[PDB]
């Protein structure tokens, strides 16, 4: 699953950045 990239991976990364 390391090779699966989609919109949801962005939003989780922007969320992590915001909340930390």
């Amino acid at each position, epitope marked *: *699953w390391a090779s*699966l*990239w*989609n*919109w*949801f991976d*962005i*939003t*989780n990364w*922007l*969320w992590y*950045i*915001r*909340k930390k």
Partner: antibody
Amino acid sequence: QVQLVQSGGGLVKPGGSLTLSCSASGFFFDNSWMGWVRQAPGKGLEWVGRIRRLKDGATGEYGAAVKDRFTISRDDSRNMLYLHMRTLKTEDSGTYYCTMDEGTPVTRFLEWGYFYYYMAVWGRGTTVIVSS
Amino acid sequence: DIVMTQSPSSVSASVGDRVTITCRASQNIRDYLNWYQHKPGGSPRLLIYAASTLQTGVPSRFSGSGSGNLFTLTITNLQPEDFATYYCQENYNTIPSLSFGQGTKVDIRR
């Protein structure tokens, strides 16, 4: 070109169970969120539920009318989406469409983590009739 | 928790006319709104997400506007294939409700 073909469903008496199936082709099933939408005869559209990728936890989320009764599941090796309907009611009759959902990240900093969510590709629909 | 009410439920028009469907939300939903086209005996078709962003492949005759709790779908130079039923949908709650409007069918005026 995206191709969704649905099967399953049909006639069943109230209180019974019924499984719908949606076969995907033309896109990366494993990397896509999927779901279902239904339309009772003479009525409008009504979201039923969605399911996430396996890596996202394969989380099944359902609408109020069907939560606790309908369950969604996926098969990434077979590229199949299933809608398991149990304890059916006459008001569950209608045309069920399986959908290929996708999202777009929101860029407004204060909403980082949120996404637009929509059904980008809809199947031809399968008819469900709950009657004795 | 979110209720969507479209208006009008029906509207008639001739080809080449400007059609304006409005969609109202029971609360503020920013720009988390979709529009769908549904022709009878056919699969629903996504037109607009993010309230105003056109989906790839949709004609530019369709434009989405509005923000908060009042949204509008406009179809300029109405065409024969555009005679169908249109729905709006909210996608605001993190716990998805994804509630549609009752729908709006566009008929041919005569």
